[model samples]
Target: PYPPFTFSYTYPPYLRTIGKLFGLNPPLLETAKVLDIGCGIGVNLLNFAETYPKSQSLGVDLSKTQIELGKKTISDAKINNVELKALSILDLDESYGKFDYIVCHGVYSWVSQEVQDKILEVLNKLLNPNGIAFVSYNTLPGWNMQNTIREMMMFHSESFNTSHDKLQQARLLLKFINDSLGNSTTPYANFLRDEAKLISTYDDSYVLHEYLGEINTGTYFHQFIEKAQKNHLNYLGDTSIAAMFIGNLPTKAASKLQAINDIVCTEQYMDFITNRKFRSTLLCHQNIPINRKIEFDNLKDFYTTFNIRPISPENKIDLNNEQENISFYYENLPEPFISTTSAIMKAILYVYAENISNPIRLEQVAKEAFKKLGKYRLQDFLATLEQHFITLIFQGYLKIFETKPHAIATITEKPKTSQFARYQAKHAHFNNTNMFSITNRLNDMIGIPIHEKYILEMLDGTHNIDDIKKSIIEKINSKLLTACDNKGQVVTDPKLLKEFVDYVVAVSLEKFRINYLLVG
Candidate 1:
């Protein structure tokens, strides 16, 4: 029913973390070995292998078609580091050799419990001691609520045999529920109506593949930990940093969480609060000690990034009543969480906000604060400000990174694009990376426009905009660019078309610079 969850970023950095792991003092990945369970069409391994050329990658899937396509993609792209096999997750064994990182994004929840067990067994057997494994699933108690809609979709489409028939039936059912509800004031009725409307907006594949499976499992967060533990895998926290902390919770829910100290218990409680429908969780060898402590010191090995633009034109941070009050917006928050704070913090937050795209050291920000404020102010505010910074970090105001981030901040005359990105532009739906590439460079798939994709495909430094425009214009005149303006009307207006294509080339290049798509 599902087309292949071939979209990008299945992104909580388990892929990029391999390089950091390889770079560690006592490295886990000597040459960076990786395995992607259910790596459909081979995009993930292709991306991983392309970005980290030395790393060897393997992908396995039950679908022969997807595996074959993946193999074809590898051959076409000339990405020799990646290999794909048509193998079931249950059949994987130690004969393949231990991988430093393993990814299981969409397979677990669709398969049987026993298959899940086998997947875990494979992970345990094939993973290096310090390896990180990624598993994404629709989890409870949030997916439980979503199941109300899913079950209804499944029931409504029960009689439909073909994929198209089921999709039409599913859409019709949602529409019927939405239209027939007809202004019911009851909370349950309103909830159902809203869900119907919400689900209607989903893609046909998302509606079909997600809910149509024989087993669309929504295991509880704590229960999954128990499952992982049984396979000698340790809970390494959430791949999504937003889900890892209580600070993202509302003030009351955040306060209530303090009483819950154990990680698994705390996560379940957090799930209950958010009604979490999905998870991208990270796991490691059971013997490794994961730091449960949340403090300023946790920033030690990681570079941090936060986008904190001021709320006002003449932005002001008032440190009144021995408390600093600042209002700002971050991409992650619905609204800025402004609270009483210190002048030192006010100085530090601005520094981070000013250079939001670039990752900087926590101590680097602290040192910059000295420049913003006179030396005398430090003695009074230093101790409390450290704690405040920690508060901001946990509250989703900071993006912590083990590996220092690099992206093309400025576009060059001969800008180069990611080979993986180039491959996706010509071959697949989008890029899929282990760190923050393929789909979500920083945000959730700031979708690459077709024109930009065109630019990315031809980015070999020798071709400038004039060269690109000349080549494209030739194709257009030759009827190679066959995108008609409806009713099969080919563009006879070559002058206007080439001018528009030129403008597209310029702005798309600008977009490449802004979106970190270039080789700065």
Candidate 2:
């Protein structure tokens, strides 16, 4: 089986922030208990235990092999707050106690109908009052297109007996279909051609489990909500906050959605509008009350960060001009956000863009914006600021956090990273593939280049800058590394080699710092 990786949306801190957005009181992450069902290797669950020493975590899976691997990792890292068990979902009962946050990712659609019901049963019985649960599955309307491709691959691979043979046969069938439809541009043909090309890039294990699996189901939004309601669980908003807002739709579609007035029906129609394939949905107890009227005051206690840039390179920003409009875009967002608000709001965006990796508190953001524009006193744009902040949140332009992350932007005299990261770098291989990856403080996985594995393994707070540079110099001199300039010319001169090593060392360290891999 393949090792599990971290999913950013399922992180407990992010889940708590999502609860706050919908006006629910969530448990404090510092002391909350977390549970992960089907937590293969417990890679994602262990991250939470390591980050917060006061919290406790439990991960259960059916595979003893994965549970053993997770236990070994936990021991090697000397983490005491986490426990792993090889237990099935049906075996869990109220005796297992309760958790404030439960995560079930990459499991629901691939399991049997009985197992799926057991997952909701466990959540209903083992969740604390006012707790949150994250569940991911394939949705209808979008999966309809992929279902066609899955059936074709299953038929072609039926003759194969082994997993390897089945994957090979499925790939061959995809190539055959692509080659048969050379340049067709019809809607169905384009979908087939595009899906075939996309499947070609996936790893063999992913194709086998997703396409050739025994049971893969896709449910409509309304149907899934109905099932949860029967289990005494209520549907919270989706992890992708952008999908919950009607403002994201076109003017005519937004009006249509607003008239629906029913949350479940509106969300179902949204699936019809966007053809959404996958969802990371949130749920809570039916007894808890949820306030859907989002207000700007909800963000007052949260920390904020942004990753955006001007839409055009030629567009200049004026921090003091309230009327000057600026269009900003983030690569992950679907559209650009055009700002035509007050000078203070413009200044806040500019400040966040300048400090892209830093998460600042809301009060600090206001203070910094005023200080940037040389305005000694505050301005009365509270009403306008409220509207703009709400607009940005709905559009998914800003990221909100419940607490400050334990990462530094500057390199210390002796740089350091987490113990978990150092362990991953040393192991460096999983399932015969180079899996030298680290989970950043923000719960995103960042893969390290194979050549840089040695550098990361050495970041244990005992090595200085000079020591790291000396190792790189030795590798270059022994012909293990080739040093080249911007024009691809090799550098052999002793003086030039010194300057090149210095430049590369500084650049590499900065990359680690901005990616949140550095703790010192």
Candidate 3:
């Protein structure tokens, strides 16, 4: 199996934020009890334990090897709030105690029907009254083509004895299929060719577990929700909030979707149109009614950060020009946001971009944006601005958080990274030949540039900026590492080398800070 890592969306804080957005009063992360089913190595839980020291976390997996590894990691990190047990999901029950957040990521669709039902049963029994559960799986409409590919891969690889052979044969089978379909223009043929090209780059473990697995179910949204309803669990929303909206679709599609009164039916039709392959769905007790009618006030007291920029630096934002539309690009979404001539909206983005390093409060955003406008304009259409801001949240242009994140976004004089990252960087050489990387405070894994692995190991909270620069200079002089320009040319000149090293160190530290790896 592939090495396990933390997923940011599965974090309890994010879960609570999502629940809060939809009108569910969830327990705070500081005091919440979190459970992870099928948690390989418990890396995710370890991160949670470290971030919220007051919270209690337990992780269960059938792999004794992984459980032991996780326990060792916990011991080495001296984390007391987390516990790991090697046990089957069927073995879990109320005796294990209830939890405010339950995470079943990357395990639901791959397990047998019995285990799948047991997961729901665990959630229904183990989750608190206002608790939230996150379950991710492959969904239909999107997996139709992939299902066809999986069938072929499974059949071809079945004759192989070992997992290594199975994976090799699977790749060979894809290559052969794509080779034999010469000059074909059918959609199926194109899909196979494209999929083969893409899958060729995936890790062997991923292909083995995803395609060659014995049980890989592809369910529909409505079907999954029906199963949850039967288990007394209700679908709150998808973790990717954008998936829950129809406003991003075409006019005809949106019109048709709006006609459907039921949210479940509307979401099902959306899957058909969008062909969604995977989902991270949130659930709660069926008795707790969800207010789907979102209001702007629901976002009060929330903090947000921007990961967007203007399409071009030349496209200056004019504070007084309310009729001038501006285009800004957000990486999470496919299309750039073409603002509707709302100066306040543009002003908000400007402020957010300026304060990208730290999460800004809603009030701070308004205050700074009004500063750009010289003052809050009584005629600035506050209602329109409110609606636009809410839409931006649904479209994933903004990340909403109940409180500030544990990691600091600014680089300190003597910078420090999380112990987890330092640990990963220290022992990264024993792993695969891939570039050394580490999981950040947000549970997202990031790869350090191949030449900067040494800098990562030095982030132990004792090294100042000058010390780091001197160390890098010494290394470069000693031929330990070479600094290169954008064109891959070595910097040999004294002046250019100094400039290059300074730039590299600054940018590297900034990257760590932006990724939420830095500690105060």
Candidate 4:
């Protein structure tokens, strides 16, 4: 497959952020082990080492040149916590110890079934007793639309000699799919058009990986769990918390699935309802005691932060919300509900509505508000809060941080960010930073604001805020980028130029602070 021009989706924060949901307790640098299968260029493995310097990192890839490049980056970065091996997982021996954490991102559905089985087998042997593994794959029903699209591309590019040639022809296929079939009214033609529309936004490399690769299989959710079961891996949960809830489903359908004993079937039923297309499943040893029941006391061992706040900031012990339909601010929220679970939600969220900017622990919110929540024990308070957050996190109302994230406060003169961010910004325009959990995402990117990429490059401890302002204006005057108004139109007036420069500079710095990219 054609690799990306710049490193993309091969970052560590995605896995690390998801791993947080599994309740890992290994202290920083406590010698925990992690492995990344098919670790291209060792970037993911490298970030894990930096984030958890005490942990041992190992990466296995089939590409020798990629391995050498990864080695050079590791050497240049002077990171001592990771090692890379250019070998297939099928040939991997027991010399690689049982890993406390195993990451197999973007590798599952791209290989033959035999290799997929071997991938699981290697993980089963290498995974430690209490360790967790993350494996991501494209799924069926959702991919049914794209599968035909892939067949179309493969058929057309059958004679293409190289990945590049195949890539060029695949581009033609995309344009053809849109221009020719995109306007047709048939269901199949519509599918082709939608697929074209979707892939048009993707990078050339990712499109090739999706359709032009040697193997591009999208599995059913249940089939994947069964395959993992054969290797002694049990399904834990989803890395994306939003997928965990289905309270909005029809009553009979949910009840029917609930009555049935198998979780595998239950998840598949969810796919039919939602047409889920991808999965990042967390797995553990089959023999380990699994507890599906969530008790409120589980919150005691944890800390949290919420992305949601009540619709109104009315400060009252218990205001008359009997007829109020107050909402929380979310970009595209899941459950914009305001009522507390267990009749205890009103006051708990009152505390939330009053404070939207600061993210607090769940226990603190519970302790502060549950005093009015009559007949509600600590269990009711905690359990329902968990439910509220889980359901809404998907919807965009709440968040659960791995640890109390570093509050990017008081921007220092020499403001510092991640060394990895520092290294990446020096080279690539689209750099990944861990801002939400560690910082940003697992399968997502926190792109630096465009026209302000130069600001990130100058964020080294060498310059302070004023220096950053001067540099941004320098780029503006050079016409490398324009200083835009609130409406995003370029500012050309001499009188407004400084004001524009200051306003953009001010807002840009504040956004950086809001996004948690500053370390100084």
C-alpha RMSD of each candidate structure in angstroms: 5.9, 3.7, 3.4, 5.3
**lDDT to native, each model:** 0.65, 0.78, 0.79, 0.65
List model 3 lDDT by residue over 369-484, tens digit each: 77766756633534544756777777777788887787887888898877767777755422333556588877777777655667877878899988898888888878664645
- Give the per-residue lDDT digits (tens) of candidate 4, residues 1-520: 2242212233333334444444443223247688888887766665557656787889889989888888877887788999998998788867888887778888888888888889888888887777777888988787786787788888978764345687778887777667776343676656457767787776655676777777677899888888988888888877666676666877987787789877788788788767677788877777766665544454443444454545555554344345555565542267674443333566666665443434566787777667645455776666667765655555534655445444354467677766665565544424222111122212223565555555765777888778877777777777664535466658556666767777787776655555556655
Q: What is the TM-score of each candidate against the true structure?
A: 0.79, 0.88, 0.89, 0.80
User: What order do you get sorting by lDDT, best first?
Assistant: 3, 2, 1, 4
The alpha-carbon lDDT assigned to residue 210 of candidate 1 equals: 69
Model 1, position 29: C-alpha lDDT score: 33
Off by over 4 Å in 1: 1-30, 158-164, 247-256, 308-354, 367-385, 428-444, 465-507
Ranking the candidates on TM-score from highest down gives: 3, 2, 4, 1
Worst lDDT 10-window in candidate 3: 428-437
Q: List the residue pairs that clash in candidate 1.
A: 142-275, 324-341, 431-438
Error of 3 at 241 (Å): 1.0
lDDT score, candidate 3, position 195: 72
- Candidate 2 Cα outliers beyond 4 Å, as residue runs: 158-169, 308-346, 380-385, 428-435, 479-494
Residue by residue across 73-157, what tens digits does model 2's lDDT show?
8899899999999998999998879999999997898888799988998999999989999999999998887888898887867
Error of 4 at 11 (Å): 8.7
Model 1 C-alpha lDDT per residue in residues 219-335, reported as the tens digit of each score: 887788888898888777665555566665578967777776777887787787767888887777767565555545545455777775676422443433264356777754679
